[PDB]
Structures are given as structure tokens and as C-alpha cells.
Amino acid sequence: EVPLGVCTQDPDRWTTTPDDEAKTLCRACPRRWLCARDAVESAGAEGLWAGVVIPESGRARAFALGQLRSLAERNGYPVRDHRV
């Protein structure tokens, strides 16, 4: 099976207090572009997904979700629009 992201160990270091070592691990993550799709499809995704810390609001959040949508599609994980 595609393995779990290492984030499942120490979830808070991705969801709540992300640091550079966590982002480094996302860059090496085998499910990174699946994770980027899922960030766009998740209600209110926040924090470190797919190597991108998603801001909680504003145009910065719009940019991060736009980038993750485009990278997801580009790597074979297009967002299902019926699920956004």
C-alpha cells in the first residue's frame, strides 16, 4: 500500500506547531501530492500539508490552496471538484 505519511508520528508538529524538520519530511513524503489534493478537498485545512503551511485566512490562504490544487493536478492527483 502507499505508506502513511510520517506526520502520523507527532501529529501536532504538522497541525499546530510546524517546524522546518517537519516540512523537510513532507518534501520526502511518498504521498505528498495525494496530500496536496486532500488539502484542497478538506474543510478548513490548516497548518502543514504537503510541505506548505496553509494560512488560516486571507489571500495567503487562497494562494496556498491554489498552489496545492495546481501541484496536485500536475502530479496526477487532480482535485475532484464535486468534493470541494
Partner: protein, 97 residues
Amino acid sequence: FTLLQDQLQSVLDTLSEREAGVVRLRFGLTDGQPRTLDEIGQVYGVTRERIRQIESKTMSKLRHPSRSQVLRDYLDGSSGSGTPEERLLRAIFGEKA
């Protein structure tokens, strides 16, 4: 086989004590009776607005793959249950998952 109840317990243990308690109260994992946000403010002694902030933020922690990716496989078997666990799962994953 790890039961959904046991997987949810392990996931909830990754939350702060107050986040876990708010979640359990909200979805009736405590006794089978879900609580309104006003009632959860009743408990914990905070305003309805803080219960709402905690709930939204905790829900986004639970949706992140660090907590959601092993729960996602239970959704289809749990959907249509009528259970509190299905209720929490559906709140995490939404109604189109």
C-alpha cells in the same frame, strides 16, 4: 482488526485534554447524547464563542492526514450505522467522502 471505537480513541488521545473532551461531548461519545455548543460552554466554563473556536480548530486538526488517514478506511463500513462514531467520522470527512 482494530475496531473503529479503538482507532477513534487513539486519534482523540493525540488532542489536548480539552479538545478531546469537547469533541466527545459534541458527538455524544460520552454517553450517546450529543451536546450543543452552549452546553459545552456550560461545561468548561467558557463562552459559546470559545467552544466554537475550539471545535472548528480541533476539527481541522482531525482532518489533517496525521490523524485522518487511518480513519478514512472505516468510513464506508460506518456510514449508515446511526452511531456516534459515524457522526464524528462524517463531521471529519464531510458528507461527500
